[PDB]
């Protein structure tokens, strides 16, 4: 599969992903969560590639890769980024773009442009918030072009203007190994809370899925294989409507191994919301809480390897993803009593590359689109 | 319908609300099940066989003072016969009315003919000296009238020296859109928030006229019956609560306001499935509405029934077997839930003549705790 350096960085990006998820889940302001572990690691890798002194060491700090050299980190993350990006193309729809926006007074250094494009496929563009709407439109047009309109907008505003903006635009659409029938679709209610219901469209299918029912913890967990079993989507959900905080306290890497080992192929009636979930995170505050303190500081950032001068600081790290839940998948082929997996309330989901075991995605759906 | 039958349809509906409210305040009454046209026919029989104030009080409770005795009997007869045969094609409806007189009493021949011509009234003689044998004749006749669906009127008859008017009924609504006969399971019916009875429920989702009164926290839905000649309307609080508050709002004009606010929405209706059997003695309640002398041994003038003033209206038995079933004619946003697992009020209304065929409430279904 992947090289030794890409495999160890894959395990560290997964630990960083769960770890970033928990920090955002503890943030009372964060609702929907959607993180790509390799894209988050690449964002930190770019800071190490363009930073000096503590700015770069803190970037390798969050990555837990200080004991690694700069070259084997970039070569490892670069391979891991390109490997998982296309090992999950052939099966599911997956579009990724990374663009670094600098102020007009900034000139990107030539060595940083070459290595950041070779390792992380990073694009470089210059922007001016002179016309703040025109600047926002340039980002949204780039994101829409990268995702073919599936993500037509990154952010509605940019609070920090005098710095560098790293924008990752993503579109992910799981292609099921066994498709839902497009007529098994109707309008139902999604209970965001016990007192707040949003009208959504739901898709329904009953089949054989790896399933575990935890009567002790009062939760359901199901594994939905993606096309040709090259990856799988795992969903963790409480039995009844409740905040996901209790389930997240059980959400560890070791507890997941216990749940994965207890699953058995059972008849499961899976009902999922249908539609595109658009999530845009500015990981700046949350990456700072993990150790990336100086890179985002106007007064103490050393990003001189990006531009030649200490005129840049990391203003925002946009992690924007459009995640489409749809019925499409591979065609498939009778008296069992199906387990009910009725996902009309917040849940946690993981996308797992069945080959390398790498975490492709981690997130939670709290609020779908809909007028209530 | 004729002009006189049309006016009697509107006034029998007003009599239904007035009769329902009186029983709802009676702490001894649980389930209520009344057919307004059958009640109106009973008052017509008192007017047909009564004299002086006994007969005029019958038209008073009927609110038919502007009609004379001639047009009241002919109007109710057509109205009863119209609804009996205009709804003999859609829903199952079996009605019997029998007047039981003492054995020493001989029903006058003209009264037997006119009461059978207008009200299809049967006449029989009984003596409660052997109380068990007399009760069996009334209950055997009711079971015969309803083909076993109503095998029993009453377990005892307190007033023996008078006349007993017995109405036996079986009514089974036939939906314009049937429930699937497999969409049936066992659930809990909350009689109160502290008392739950195991019942069977039937479930269907479809387009129904619906109104949600968020201020009063009640739901009201219109279920069309077969071929849309009548509708079954259900009034229910959002959660389980005593019906006393909702009954206070239940008027003839308020029902017009609620029906006027309805819109066809997707509704998932869940109803108890089974036969509800209710037997009322309307004697006490009809007196409270104005029929005071007919039930009094010392001042009843029912001489047109039997030739002697030895008769008074002892009891007016109104016994109904009302079956909730899935059967009906064979036949989209996010449906509202009309989950009837707690007491509710229901009305069956003939959409053409506006006559109210039934009004009642289900407080206690059959079952165990």
């Amino acid at each position: 599969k992947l090289s030794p350096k890409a495999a160890t960085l894959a395990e560290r990006s997964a630990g960083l992903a769960f770890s970033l998820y928990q920090a955002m889940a503890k943030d009372q302001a964060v609702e929907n969560i959607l993180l790509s572990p390799v894209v988050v690691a690449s964002s930190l890798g770019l800071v190490s590639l363009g930073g000096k002194a503590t700015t770069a060491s803190q970037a390798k700090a969050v990555l837990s890769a200080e004991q690694l050299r700069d070259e084997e980190v970039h070569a490892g993350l670069g391979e891991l980024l390109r490997s998982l990006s296309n090992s999950t193309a052939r099966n599911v729809t997956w579009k990724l773009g990374s663009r670094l926006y600098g102020p007009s007074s900034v000139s990107f250094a030539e060595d940083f442009v070459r290595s950041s494009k070779q390792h992380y496929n990073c694009e470089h563009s210059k922007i001016n918030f002179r016309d703040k709407r025109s600047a926002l439109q340039s980002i949204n047009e780039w994101a829409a072009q990268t995702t073919d309109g599936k993500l037509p907008e990154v952010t509605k505003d940019v609070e920090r203007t005098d710095g560098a903006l790293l924008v990752n635009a993503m579109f992910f659409k799981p292609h099921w190994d066994e498709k839902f029938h497009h007529k098994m679709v109707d309008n139902r209610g999604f209970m965001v809370t016990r007192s707040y219901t949003v009208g959504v469209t739901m898709m329904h299918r009953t089949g054989l899925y790896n399933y575990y029912d935890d009567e002790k913890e009062k939760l359901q967990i199901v594994e939905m294989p993606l096309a040709h079993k090259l990856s799988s989507l795992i969903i963790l959900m409480p039995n009844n409507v409740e905040p996901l905080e209790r389930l997240e306290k059980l959400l560890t890497k070791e507890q997941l191994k216990i749940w994965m080992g207890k699953m058995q192929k059972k008849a499961v009636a899976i009902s999922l919301p249908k539609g595109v979930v658009e999530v845009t995170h500015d990981l700046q505050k949350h990456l700072a809480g993990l150790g990336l303190t100086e890179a985002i500081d106007k007064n103490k950032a050393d990003l001189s390897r990006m531009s030649g001068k200490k005129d840049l600081y990391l203003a925002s790290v946009f992690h924007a993803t459009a995640f489409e839940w749809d019925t499409e998948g591979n065609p498939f082929d009778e008296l069992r009593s199906p387990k009910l997996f009725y996902a009309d309330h917040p849940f946690i989901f993981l996308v797992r590359d069945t080959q390398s075991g790498s975490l492709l995605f981690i997130g939670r759906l709290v609020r779908p689109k809909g007028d209530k | 319908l004729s002009p006189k039958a049309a006016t009697l349809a509107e006034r029998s509906a007003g009599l239904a609300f007035s009769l329902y409210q009186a029983m709802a305040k009676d702490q001894a009454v649980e389930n209520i099940l009344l057919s307004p046209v059958v009640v109106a026919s009973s008052l017509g029989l008192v007017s047909l066989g009564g004299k002086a104030t006994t007969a005029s009080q019958a038209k008073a409770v009927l609110s038919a003072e502007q009609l004379r005795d001639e047009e009241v009997h002919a109007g109710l007869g057509e109205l009863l016969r119209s609804l009996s045969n205009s709804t003999a094609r859609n829903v199952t409806w079996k009605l019997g009315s029998r007047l039981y007189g003492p054995s020493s009493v001989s029903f006058a021949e003209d009264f037997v003919r006119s009461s059978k011509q207008h009200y299809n009234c049967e006449h029989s003689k009984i003596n409660f000296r052997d109380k068990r044998s007399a009760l069996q004749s009334i209950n055997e006749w009711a079971a015969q009238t309803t083909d076993g669906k109503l095998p029993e009127v009453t377990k005892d008859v307190e007033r023996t020296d008078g006349a007993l008017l017995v109405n036996a009924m079986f009514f089974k609504p036939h939906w314009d859109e049937k429930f699937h006969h497999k969409m049936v399971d066992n659930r809990g019916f909350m009689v109160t928030r502290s008392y739950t009875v195991g019942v069977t429920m039937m479930h269907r989702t479809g387009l129904y006229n619906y109104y949600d009164d968020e201020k009063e926290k009640l739901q009201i839905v219109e279920m069309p019956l077969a071929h849309k000649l009548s509708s079954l309307i259900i009034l229910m609080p959002n959660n389980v609560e005593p019906l006393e508050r909702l009954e206070k709002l239940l008027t003839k004009e308020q029902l017009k306001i609620w029906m006027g606010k309805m819109q066809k929405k997707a509704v998932a209706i869940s109803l108890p499935k089974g036969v509800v059997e209710v037997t009322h003695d309307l004697q006490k309640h009809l007196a409270g509405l104005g029929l005071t002398e007919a039930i009094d041994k010392n001042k009843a003038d029912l001489s047109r029934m039997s030739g002697k003033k030895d008769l008074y209206l002892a009891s007016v038995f109104h016994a109904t077997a009302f079956e909730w079933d899935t059967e009906g004619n064979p036949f989209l946003r996010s449906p509202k839930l009309f989950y009837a697992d707690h007491p509710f009020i229901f009305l069956v209304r003939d959409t053409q003549s506006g006559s109210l065929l039934f009004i009642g409430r289900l407080v206690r279904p059959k079952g165990d705790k």
Partner: peptide
Amino acid sequence: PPGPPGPRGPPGP
């Protein structure tokens, strides 16, 4: 056709 609605929820806190 869709199945019946689920049973009523538990009481509140």
